[PDB]
RNA sequence: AAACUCCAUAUAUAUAAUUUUAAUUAUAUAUAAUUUUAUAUUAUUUAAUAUAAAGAAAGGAAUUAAGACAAAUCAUAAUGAUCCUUAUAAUAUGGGUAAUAGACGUGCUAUAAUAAAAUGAUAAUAAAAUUAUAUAAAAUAUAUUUAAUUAUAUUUAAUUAAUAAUAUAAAACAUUUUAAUUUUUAAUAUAUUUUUUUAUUAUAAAUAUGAAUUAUAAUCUGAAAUUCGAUUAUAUGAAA
RNA sequence: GUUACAGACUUAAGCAGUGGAGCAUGUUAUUUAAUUCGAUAAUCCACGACUAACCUUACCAUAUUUUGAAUAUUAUAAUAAU
């Protein structure tokens, strides 16, 4: 069917296949996130007995990759690069070059101070 | 609040209230509608009114109250305690007015 | 998850069928504490090409299946 | 302080009573290092895949009478065209 | 004594997208919407009339002008008697399709991308030479062949024969004294005053000062280079420079008014852009610059 | 090129109800210097060297032309040409990028007294920067007996920023030590050096430097530190 | 292996260092299933990389996909509906 386990949009603007996967994941872990946070919620608490934890810290190791943001990198949306990516302006140490210069980026030129 | 249930709330508000300023501030941040926050300060504060003007259970008057928070903050404070000596400020030695 | 609380590793493993006949469980995983409950089989253990067949020791215990498990082959000599 | 620790919890817990606060006399961990886990989370999807976008062409179900020219899309279709003329198109894909 | 808020361009202008959001991580959002946003838009410069021609409507960069109240993205229009008066034609129709088109139309959908009022305006012009984007746009875009080999004899002439060659040193001289006049007049009368506004500056009105005042106007001189795979016969490079006039305001050269510069690295009159599109040679690269004093 | 430009500096105006408090500030603006004035030697109509005298006067940054090196990038992106479409395209798990005879470059930490370590709560003294993909203060428990420090764990105060947090800046300064060093001590007495003096007996090249390194236990993060992260405690203490 | 000027950390000073030790690195040589790829005088070598456990990742082994990430065409049937 779809490539991917579960249909998701495709990211507007620059489409990269690495994009497309950390996408991918990043919708996924999105929604499993509270699940995520519930299951080890439950394997961490001590106030607990060992059996219902255990269940839990195994369901997660089960749990599909794309249920992971370690595994989401930070990304330029415009180059789709993970190298040198600023977070600020979600883009890599060139296109922000590039679009700081040009003015793309406003309130964004060089630092002359 | 009373002495004993003014001291009581004091040590009741701990961090949140500032000895030095002998301020109570609490802020709410847990429900979407900035509302719903501001009746749960409104009920946090009956609530401490509540418990300090009743010292059935414990007066805490014993407890001394806490105010490491503000000495910490005070050491964060930058303020000058010391002015120019009053023996030092010489009014003869200013200049008198002078009319035009 | 190396710690005195949330001790140790859970892997899902086939050991529950395996503990019958023993058949070496492929545990391509390669990335859980030994048992220290079934602590007792044999399996292969995915060398990055090929499943290396170990079983049980009286050494095996904390020690993870992939310390048993070498990838990497050795080093060897110059150009002559 | 020169104060009974014994009170000190108490004004702890007073506290814990005032302000909705947690009490861990015990010190056993609560998973309240999750419970209070009430960041932002969807942030990654504020950003990166947020859907909604005109994808170039989209433009034709809307704006009708007008006969837009996607200029990009066209200059693929040539150079398509071009490579199957001159045998350097493409194999075709096996249909198992 | 002070640059008139008409003559020194704001920073914002020098931003292509001017937004302030406090949730900074948001704003990342909303630029990112903004450039894609000018794509798609960019591409909806395409026309069609019955395989007959494509009137390509060459547009500015999305001068995205965000701000609480509502959205103003803004853009510059430029395209080629007694008859598109009792029709309107494509670009009137685009027009269309931005604001005018009650809900059908574009300023609408796009309402449900920032969440606040989308209000498109674009700005029609006479002189694709007055914008340095647009100019080297047409140039990547309608000459391609008139340059792809070599630089048509005339085609060149033409692009160096446009402005008279301003003398921006006269141009300057001549702003700088009505600076100076005006502010003298102002100048005596507030004397006349100092030994109700009507005197405070009198015989000073939208006339003698609303334009005088205005600098950057005159194309002094522009430069257009041709850079790339333009060589039919050479699959190397053909950088072709056009260098004409200078690129110098003498009115800061002596005069109370500085340079200022755009992004702090490229002075405010000094505006230049290349528009990249791949010849059948190969893609290439012609950037224009132009001073307009 | 210079100049305008940015930081920075002098002054001046406006703003801040001096509780966002730093008014010794923060900015917006304006002026200012690419310093000037005067005399005396020289020179030849007027420049240099000294002297004074007026001012606060002093820097950094950005900008690196044309061309050439067919310099670097087809892995930021993009595109021509050419090569594959059941595989040179996409996905999951594991592995690898961390492999090591030798060799190179760059760092770090080093080899102790014109130098290193404890300690200093009326917290000696800063700028710049961060904090809705969060910082995380006080305490509280342990490591550990007091306490402090240091590291983790419990609970989240306040602050989404001239408000609260990271964070009491540290070096300097003071005192205490410190191998070799027999320059030491510790038992005597000795005495107008007392934290010291002196007489006598004793005190047999890596140290109390160095932390490479090796075990064990413990803690962080996350499904997951095994190839492969970080931290600490107890041990180890090569090389130099 | 040229007459004469001038410039800068170019040299002579001066201070701190590298080469000598251990470690961390980037690299060459080599190994390997793979140790992805690129820079290699000056301008390569804590350089592309502002962080490689997985992801990143490009590479190797093992399985698995074939109109697939689009655009445009040909038809059948479920979903909002003026």
């Keep these: 069917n779809f490539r991917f386990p579960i249909k998701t949009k495709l990211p507007p603007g620059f489409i990269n296949a690495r994009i497309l996967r950390d996408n991918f994941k990043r919708q996924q872990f999105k929604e499993n996130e509270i699940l995520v946070k519930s299951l080890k919620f439950i394997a961490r608490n001590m106030n607990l007995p060992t059996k219902l934890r255990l269940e839990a810290q195994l369901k997660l190791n089960a749990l599909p990759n794309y249920m992971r943001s370690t595994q989401i990198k930070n990304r330029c949306v415009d180059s789709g690069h993970a190298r040198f990516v600023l977070s600020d302006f979600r883009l890599c140490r060139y296109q922000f070059r590039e679009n700081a210069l040009k003015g793309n980026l406003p309130g964004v030129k060089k630092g002359i101070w | ?100 | 998850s190396r710690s005195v609380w949330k001790g140790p590793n859970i892997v899902p493993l086939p050991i529950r069928e395996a503990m019958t006949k023993g058949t070496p469980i492929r545990t391509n995983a390669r990335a859980a504490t030994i048992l220290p409950q079934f602590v007792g089989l044999k399996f292969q253990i995915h060398n990055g090409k090929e499943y290396v067949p170990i079983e049980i020791s009286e050494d095996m215990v904390g020690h993870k299946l992939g310390e048993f498990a070498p990838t990497r082959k050795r080093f060897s000599y110059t150009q002559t | 302080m020169n104060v009974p620790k014994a009170r000190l919890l108490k004004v702890a817990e007073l506290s814990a009573k005032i302000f909705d606060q947690n009490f861990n006399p015990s010190g056993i961990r609560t998973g309240s290092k999750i419970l209070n886990e009430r960041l932002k989370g969807p942030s990654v999807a504020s950003y990166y895949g947020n859907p909604d976008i005109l994808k170039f062409r989209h433009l034709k179900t809307l704006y009708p009478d007008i006969e837009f020219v996607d200029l990009e899309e066209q200059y693929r279709l040539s150079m398509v065209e071009a490579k199957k003329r001159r045998g350097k198109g493409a194999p075709k894909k096996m249909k198992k | 004594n002070i640059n008139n808020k008409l003559q020194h361009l704001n920073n914002m202008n020098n931003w292509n997208t001017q937004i302030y959001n406090y949730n900074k991580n948001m704003e990342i959002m909303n630029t990112m919407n903004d450039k894609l946003i000018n794509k798609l838009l960019y591409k909806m410069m395409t026309l069609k009339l019955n395989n007959m021609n494509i009137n390509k409507i060459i547009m500015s960069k999305t001068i995205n002008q965000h701000s609480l109240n509502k959205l103003n993205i803004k853009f510059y229009y430029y395209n080629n008697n007694n008859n598109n008066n009792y029709y309107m034609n494509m670009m009137n129709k685009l027009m269309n399709i931005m604001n005018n088109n009650m809900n059908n139309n574009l300023c609408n959908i796009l309402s449900y991308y920032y969440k606040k009022k989308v209000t498109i305006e674009p700005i029609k012009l006479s002189y694709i030479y007055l914008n340095s984007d647009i100019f080297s746009k047409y140039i990547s875009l309608n000459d391609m062949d008139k340059y792809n080999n070599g630089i048509l004899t005339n085609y060149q002439r033409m692009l160096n024969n446009i402005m008279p060659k301003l003398n921006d040193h006269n141009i300057s001289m001549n702003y700088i004294n009505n600076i100076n006049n005006i502010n003298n007049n102002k100048y005596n009368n507030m004397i006349n005053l100092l030994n109700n506004i009507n005197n405070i500056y009198n015989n000073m009105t939208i006339d003698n000062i609303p334009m005088d005042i205005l600098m950057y106007k005159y194309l002094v001189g522009w430069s257009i280079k041709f850079k790339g795979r333009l060589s039919n016969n050479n699959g190397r490079t053909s950088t072709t420079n056009l260098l004409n006039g200078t690129f110098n305001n003498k009115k800061y050269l002596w005069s109370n008014i500085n340079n200022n510069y755009k992004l702090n690295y490229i002075p405010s009159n000094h505006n230049l852009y290349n528009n990249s599109n791949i010849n059948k040679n190969g893609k290439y690269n012609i950037k224009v610059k132009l001073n307009f004093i």
């Design chain 2, 1 to 100: 609040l009373e002495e004993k249930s003014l001291h009581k709330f004091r040590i009741l508000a701990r961090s949140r209230y500032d000895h030095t300023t002998d301020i109570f501030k609490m802020s709410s941040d847990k429900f979407e509608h900035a509302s719903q926050n501001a009746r749960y300060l409104h009920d946090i504060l009956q609530r401490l009114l509540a418990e300090s003007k009743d010292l059935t259970e414990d007066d805490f008057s014993d407890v001394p109250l806490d105010t490491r928070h503000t000495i910490a903050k005070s050491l964060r404070k930058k303020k000058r305690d010391y002015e120019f000596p009053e023996h030092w400020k010489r009014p003869e030695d200013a200049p008198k007015k002078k009319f035009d």
